[PDB]
Amino acid sequence: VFDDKLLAVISGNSIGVLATIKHDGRPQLSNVQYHFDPRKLLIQVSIAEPRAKTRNLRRDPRASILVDADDGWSYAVAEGTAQLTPPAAAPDDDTVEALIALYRNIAGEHSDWDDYRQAMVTDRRVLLTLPISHVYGLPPGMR
Amino acid sequence: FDDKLLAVISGNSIGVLATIKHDGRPQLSNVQYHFDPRKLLIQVSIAEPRAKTRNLRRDPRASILVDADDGWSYAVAEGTAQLTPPAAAPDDDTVEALIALYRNIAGEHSDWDDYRQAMVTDRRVLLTLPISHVYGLPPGMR
């Protein structure tokens, strides 16, 4: 089905353009590294509490991510309502554990997890989980 | 504006356009664009919006994200869009503006009569975005 074509675009990449909504209602755009879980139909991203994107999502959790197909022109967009963890606050906390799981999915096994844990707390990192509620776009064969 | 970010815009010709849908969510798409570095504006053509996208006709705030050629760098141009009426006849002012846009991006088209017809069939609008703010992550020496 059309949905499978769009989800194939998302599964075939690890970078996308995240659109959050500013205080005044206009879109704010940035790029993000992500992991796609096909079982739960989730996109997971690590974001830092001080950043504009995170501040925007705390106010209005609606998020979209556009992903390019392997031709660099066809694309898919996932829409959903973001679920954010609290910022990492102690090296052993549940947010840090979720960020360790994400790192393993995106980057593999870290050489010094204690360093990683410290860094997550220092950077006040947050795990953004976006359940995909809707997909649209122009996948390969349609451009 | 940061010249490093303007250079990103100058050196590419596609990006991610974001407009505002009725319910407040951004609508995203990959588009081709022209950048005028003197006037500091970006031009794209879109089919006349319908359904939730139509809100662009009452709230023309828009942004475009453009990738650099390095790992992660990017530039975003933000402004308030100016729209033509949609193309309705193959020789109307909108189509003439769209022909100039084509020339600006891609040079001389090999069959302008085919192009004119396609603009009318797609109800094509020329969106002009004078740049009000530029942000992002500038690339370094490479």
Q: What is the dihedral angle through the alpha carbons of A50, A53, A55, A59, rounded to the nearest 10 degrees? A: -170
Question: What is the distance between the alpha carbons of residues B122 and B120, in angstroms, rounded to a whole number?
Answer: 5
Q: Report which DSSP code applies to A86.
A: P
- Strand, helix or coil for residue B66: strand
Pairing mode, strands B41-47 and B124-130: antiparallel
B109: alpha, beta or left? (left if phi > 0; alpha if psi -120 to 50): beta
B25 annotated as ligand-binding: no
Q: Measure the N-to-C terminal CA separation of chain A; round to a whole number of Å.
A: 17
**From which experimental method does this structure derive?**
X-ray
Shortest Cα distance, chain B CAs vs residue A136, angstroms: 9
Strand partners, A53: none
Question: What is the distance between the alpha carbons of residues A129 and A78, in angstroms, rounded to a whole number?
Answer: 12
Annotated binding residues of A for coenzyme F420-(gamma-Glu)n, as ranges?
28, 33, 46, 52-56, 73-75, 134
Cited resolution, angstroms: 1.8
Question: What is the distance between the alpha carbons of residues A138 and A79, in angstroms, rounded to a whole number?
Answer: 15
Question: What is the distance between the alpha carbons of residues B111 and B16, in angstroms, rounded to a whole number?
Answer: 28
Asked if B123 and B86 count as a contact pair (C-beta separation under 8 A), the reply is: yes
Domains and CATH numbers, chain B: 1-142 (2.30.110.10)
